[PDB]
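Entry, Tuesday afternoon. Goal for today is a structural model of the target with A1BLX bound, before we commit to ordering more compound. Inputs were pasted exactly as handed over by J.K., no edits. I checked the ligand SMILES twice against the vendor sheet because last time a stereocentre got dropped in transcription.
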Amino acid sequence: LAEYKCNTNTAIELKLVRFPEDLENDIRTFFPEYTHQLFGDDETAFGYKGLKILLYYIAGSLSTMFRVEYASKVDCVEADDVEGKIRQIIPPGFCTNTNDFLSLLEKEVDFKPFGTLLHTYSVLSPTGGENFTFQIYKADMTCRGFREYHERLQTFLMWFIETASFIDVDDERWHYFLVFEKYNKDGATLFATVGYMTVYNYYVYPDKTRPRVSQMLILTPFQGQGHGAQLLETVHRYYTEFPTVLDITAEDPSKSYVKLRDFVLVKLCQDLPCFSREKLMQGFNEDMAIEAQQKFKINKQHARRVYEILRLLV
Ligand SMILES: CCOc1cc([C@@H]2CC(=O)NC3=C2C(=O)C[C@H](c2ccc(F)cc2)C3)cc([N+](=O)[O-])c1O
């Protein structure tokens, strides 16, 4: 009976599929960092030998294939309801075989990003020379198709963020920022989902808001390319255009958030007059927090952090 225990982290094969060959290419597969919300602290599932859970997503639209496969199952002993648990966290309408999934691949040419283009950037390839092209969009639930797309996307929070939980999309104070990569296929330019960030537009009495970063997910294949830095920079630059925004902060200031934040705020602030070599040496001044707030909606306390870093650099 213990011979029917399978670790679920390694059993759940995720894929982002651009071309048919991606189905057969194990390099394209990645795996959950967390499955405890479905399978407990032990991250094991009872009842199956050779358990394979397939969640294949078409790279842009995230149209989904979901299949459970196994060598054998125990079915007066009852296997864990793997299917049922996964169905809690993914929308209906998934297909269940590779043929139907490949059919969806043909229609992917028509998939277009949701919302407003805010920024376009290039990342250099590891090999060097080739640039990949990326775009950040701001979307909301008024954009046709986005709600369904967000349901397909958010599942990933479960696999890669430890304390992850789904948001209430009917709350209009949610802002969505999406990252896409442009890629070529047979002469056409298609879009691939890279990541996203949800930002909550907290009300501040009486006429102001204070955006707070809630979640940010960069999908595993795109990690270590600087997407989070672009995403946060873009969000700061976006909300700067609104006088009614006080500042931008994070709900959950992790070590990695703080590292990312310190990177971006230094990038944004080093070329400002108030943070010049000469002005830094005179000490920290309220002027610095003022200018940082006006120019990039940087929190008063965050500007103190930037000051220390910049003053060390000098
Ligand atoms: C080799 C590892 O490469 C990367 C890892 C990450 C992770 C993983 C992920 O998907 N989410 C985030 C990450 C963080 O480190 C911190 C971030 C965070 C941002 C804002 C905020 F308000 C609160 C948290 C959440 C991002 C990137 N990236 O480039 O963005 C990696 O390259």
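Residues 146-160 form the longest helix (15 residues).
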